[PDB]
């Protein structure tokens, strides 16, 4: 019934007999998807400057590696920002508090977020019975997957780009600790001398 | 040391202050404190008396020895301030003894 089912569970997690807590079918399909959606943001978001900068669109300052942005101060922090990294992290917490807890309240109560006023948006945030796939004019402006078949296939398309982008992030990290360079400088140096620029070296 | 010299206690050949326990040079050593106790002990005892009796008539009294009726106890607590005046009057009245 879940999309991305190619039958891969050595560890009997999704087995619904005597389930409890966070080892719940409804729950994990959710995680994987939200995981997928974030992972694809990170994958395309980590590289883009290193690429676009090298491409010569982005100035000399901005064109940094992913771990040199000021997330991990000791690996490098940026300067040229609207503010310091901590006056940001607060603007983050308030926002992600709102926009993650709301999303939790659709999971917890389907109908909720539809009733209690929220600057006109309460009309929007009704849900879709299914949690992972809310839609409505906010989160599906183009009304794509107009049929049940075309939707199920788009749900197939989503999870696979995701799972790939999650491994890609497991990539960029495990890669950055051993190399100490960004996964686009690793790629171009690997085009130049495939056997010299390698794990084994 | 200065505040025992001002108090005027009797110090022996030892160099330590000994105490006087009968009559009036050294009343405050024992004679005053003594009443202090018999009061506060009598206070505690008579509050405890008025609690156990006040429960006694209520189907199962044993529950009130454990899940103590706090707002009963805290009313008896203050009532137990004037206890010798009640304790005497109760010895008079003849409700004090079985």
């Amino acid at each position: 019934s879940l999309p991305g089912d190619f039958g891969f569970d050595p560890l009997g997690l999704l087995d619904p007999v005597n389930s409890g807590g966070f080892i719940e079918p409804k729950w994990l399909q959710y995680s994987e998807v939200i995981h997928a959606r974030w992972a694809m943001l990170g994958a395309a978001g980590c590289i883009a400057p290193e690429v676009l900068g090298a491409a010569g669109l982005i100035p000399d300052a901005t064109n940094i590696k992913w771990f040199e942005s000021g997330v991990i101060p000791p690996a490098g922090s940026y300067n040229g920002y609207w503010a310091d990294p901590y006056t940001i992290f607060f603007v983050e917490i308030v926002a992600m508090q709102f926009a993650e807890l709301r999303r939790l309240q659709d999971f917890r109560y389907p109908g909720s977020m539809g009733q209690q006023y929220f600057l006109g948006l309460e009309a929007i945030f009704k849900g879709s019975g299914d949690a992972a796939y809310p839609g409505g004019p906010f989160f599906n402006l183009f009304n794509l997957g107009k049929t049940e078949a075309a939707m199920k296939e788009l749900k197939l398309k989503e999870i696979k780009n995701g799972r790939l982008a999650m491994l890609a992030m497991l990539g960029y990290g495990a890669q950055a600790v051993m190399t100490g360079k960004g996964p686009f400088q690793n790629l171009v140096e690997h085009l130049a001398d495939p056997v010299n620029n390698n794990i084994l070296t | 040391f200065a505040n025992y010299a001002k108090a005027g206690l009797l110090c022996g050949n030892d160099g330590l202050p000994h105490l006087i326990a009968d009559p009036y040079g050294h009343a405050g050593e024992v004679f005053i404190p003594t009443f202090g106790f018999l009061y506060v002990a009598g206070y505690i005892g008579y509050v405890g008396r008025q609690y156990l009796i006040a429960v006694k008539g209520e189907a199962k009294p044993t529950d009130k020895e454990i899940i103590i009726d706090v707002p009963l106890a805290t009313k008896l607590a203050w009532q137990g301030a004037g206890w010798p005046l009640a304790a005497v009057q109760e010895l008079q009245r003849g409700t004090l003894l079985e």
Binding site: G20 | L52, K60
Partner: protein
């Protein structure tokens, strides 16, 4: 199919049962008529087996109970760190170990307690600690208090998480019986994840944090001036400079060129001469090996794939002629009885804590450990105790299994049956061997006292006159020091200086030196072995006849915990298994007490002291070998002479130890009232007192009752132990600190 099985929301989480004491039993739930109620509800608070017959509910209770325990322990660990950060001398102690006394407690200024804040060094006034945290901290590479604060806050969070975990796994998602029975999986995960990955990741801490920071400190450079342990990670230039093989990175690892890692992964042994502790490099390699061993070991048992052993198969295989059917039936027992498991586990934990004491005695693993005699005596005595207790507990629960769980009809087992069928021979032989041992150990001391009193020293058991040499022990010592040459070539020095030579000393004090073994040592060991055999006699007799004997054939029906079966049969006082545990505790206390006395006298006389012009002055001047051969020698040269510092501890920082010295005697003696008497007297006393109450209308509804016979015994043994142990506690610490 080993898999996650859980019940959803089995118990609602309102305070409806808090407000009802004794909810857990139908008997107590009715309320108190007598005061005995009060005791009973605390006695049986954790006794889940009598509450319910359901193995599921019990199983859910037991670990949630364990999550609660772990929460408490974290909170405890949190405590020590915080105080070590907030109320301590550690930074002062991280700059002149030799001349600062470790302190991590301050008293408030009221009621003269101020005097307890003693002259401990580093410009700080306080209580000298003997827990040994300061050395842990140096071993872990801790340099500043801030770090201790941060560790403390982490422990508090972990406490919260464990408490959450325990509520969760009972009130939201309680695992199913099936779950708890996945023994093979439990064993594998505990061996490989917990121990294996534990010592592996630790070894990570040791190789990346401990080893570098330690070398710079031992070099002598000011701790404030020492680089921070994350910069060791991102600047490996500092690590390359300290040990060269880092230049090659993790390449030598994969290429199997491990010999290049001989910089920080050694096998030298002995002590670090500048600190009197084991090499951290030896320890790092120790944990590295151990991690691999445990990791591969944790892949023995069958789980969700064909591969792996089955416990039941290995058990059912192992049978022979003399035993009949052998191990058969044991798996089923040890997958259905918590008691049996508890019994096993307590025996081996306990044994472990004692071996930990010794191995920590002989091989000080922390910096400036060996030379902090207070810490060393405290730790060895402590760990020797808790072991003691745990072993007796093993016996207790073994018997509880024997009474409550054993059912031959349903869960048969023959090993057990054959043991039961010849118990009489076992107990009779243990009896014999114990009288033997008693005579040929105590008897030797009495003989010595008599010969010494009658003016015949040439007839005594002593190195001078009689020789009873520990020839074996001396052989093994011989083999141990010569081992680095022949049987362990790659090892540079000995494991310990108490076997080898090379007397290593720090700050003018003796860290460690060869321990001579003579007649006196021959004596005390055989006393021990006597004491252990007696304790085993009591406890084994307790467990084997828990169910039935010639006197009481139906003892099994009467319970584990019960006083007697009357004055009949001539009199049947203390027949129960509990009573065996009862008496077992006294002999255990006896045995353990001679061990630690042995330890303390041994250490002050033959080992510890100051180091002068090419020579050694021991604390008690090697009197042991000549004095410990008579009871009078203990009485005078140990007890009488050593108690000096405790008895005059008044007016000082150590006065609390004098107070506790007296208080512990008080409480010890106080136990004797309960132990020597019986509740018949007490109940009549109580009758008269109750009269007096009723006369004044002050009688309680909860009818005042004397303690049960069993409770009298429990209170007795408890106060006896607490008194005894606390007295020895005040003794040693005031002694060794002063």
């Amino acid at each position: 199919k080993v898999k996650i099985a859980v019940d959803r929301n089995p118990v609602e989480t309102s305070f409806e049962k808090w407000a009802k004491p004794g909810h857990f039993s139908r008997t107590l739930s009715k309320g108190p008529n007598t005061t005995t109620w009060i005791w009973n509800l605390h006695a049986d608070a954790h006794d889940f087996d009598s509450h319910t017959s359901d193995l599921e509910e019990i199983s859910r209770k037991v670990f949630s109970a364990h999550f609660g325990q772990l929460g408490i322990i974290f909170i405890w660990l949190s405590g020590m760190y915080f105080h070590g950060a907030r109320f301590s001398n550690y930074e002062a102690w991280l700059s002149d170990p030799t001349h600062i006394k470790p302190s991590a407690q301050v008293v408030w200024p009221i009621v003269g307690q101020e005097i307890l804040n003693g002259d401990v060094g580093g410009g700080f006034q306080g209580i000298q600690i003997t827990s040994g945290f300061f050395q842990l901290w140096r071993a872990s590479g801790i340099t500043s208090e801030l770090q201790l604060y941060t560790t403390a806050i982490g422990g508090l969070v972990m406490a919260a998480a464990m408490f959450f975990a325990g509520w969760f796994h009972y009130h939201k998602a309680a695992p199913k019986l099936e779950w708890f029975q996945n023994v093979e999986s439990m064993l594998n995960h505990h061996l490989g994840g917990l121990l294996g990955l534990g010592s592996l990741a630790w070894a990570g801490h040791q190789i990346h944090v401990s080893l570098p920071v330690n070398k710079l400190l031992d070099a002598g450079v000011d701790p404030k001036e020492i680089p921070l342990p994350h910069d060791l990670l991102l600047n490996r230039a500092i690590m390359a400079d300290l040990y060269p093989s880092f230049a090659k990175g993790i390449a030598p690892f994969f290429t199997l060129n491990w010999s290049e890692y001989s910089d920080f992964l050694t096998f030298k042994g002995g002590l670090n001469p500048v600190t009197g502790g084991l090499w951290l490099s030896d320890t790092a390699h120790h944990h590295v090996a151990i991690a691999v061993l445990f990791l591969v070991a944790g892949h023995m048992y069958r789980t969700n794939w064909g591969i792996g052993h089955s416990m039941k198969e290995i058990l059912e295989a192992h049978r022979g002629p003399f035993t009949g059917e052998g191990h058969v039936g044991l798996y089923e027992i040890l997958t259905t009885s918590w008691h049996a498991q508890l019994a096993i586990n307590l025996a081996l934990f306990g044994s472990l804590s004692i071996i930990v004491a010794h191995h920590m005695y002989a091989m000080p693993p922390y910096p400036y450990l060996a030379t902090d005699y207070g810490t060393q005596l405290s730790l060895f005595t402590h760990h020797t105790w808790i072991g003691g207790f745990c072993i007796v507990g093993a016996g207790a629960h073994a018997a509880i299994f024997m009474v409550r769980d054993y059912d031959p009809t349903n869960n048969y087992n023959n090993l057990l049956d054959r043991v039961i069928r010849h118990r009489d021979a076992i107990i009779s032989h243990l009896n014999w061997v114990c009288i033997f041992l008693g005579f040929h150990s105590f008897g030797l001391y009495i003989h010595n006292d008599t010969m010494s009193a009658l003016g015949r020293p040439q007839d005594m058991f002593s190195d001078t006159a009689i020789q009873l040499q520990p020839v074996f022990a001396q052989w093994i010592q011989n083999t141990h020091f010569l081992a680095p040459q022949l049987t362990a070539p790659n090892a540079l020095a000995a494991t310990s200086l108490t076997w080898g030579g090379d007397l290593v000393a720090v700050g003018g004090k003796v860290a460690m030196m060869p321990i001579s073994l003579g007649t006196s040592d021959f004596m005390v060991h055989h006393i021990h072995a006597f004491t252990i055999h007696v304790t085993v006699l009591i406890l084994l007799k307790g467990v084997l006849f828990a169910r039935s004997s010639r006197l009481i054939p139906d003892k099994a029906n009467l319970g584990f915990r019960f006083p007697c079966d009357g004055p009949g049969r001539g009199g049947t006082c203390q027949v129960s298994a509990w009573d065996h545990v009862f008496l077992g505790l006294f002999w255990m206390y006896n045995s353990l007490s001679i061990v630690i006395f042995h330890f303390s006298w041994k250490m002050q006389s033959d080992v510890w002291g100051t180091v002068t012009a090419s020579g050694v002055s021991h604390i008690t001047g090697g009197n042991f070998a000549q004095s410990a051969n008579t009871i009078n020698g203990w009485l005078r040269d140990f007890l009488w002479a050593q108690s000096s510092q405790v008895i005059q501890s008044y007016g000082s920082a150590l006065s609390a130890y004098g107070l506790i010295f007296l208080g512990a005697h008080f409480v010890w003696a106080f136990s004797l009232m309960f132990l020597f008497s019986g509740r018949g007297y007490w109940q009549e006393l109580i009758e008269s007192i109750v009269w007096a109450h009723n006369k004044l209308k002050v009688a309680p509804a909860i009818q005042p009752r004397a303690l049960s016979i069993t409770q009298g015994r429990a209170v007795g043994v408890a106060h006896y132990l607490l008194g005894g142990i606390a007295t020895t506690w005040s003794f040693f610490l005031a002694r060794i600190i002063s």
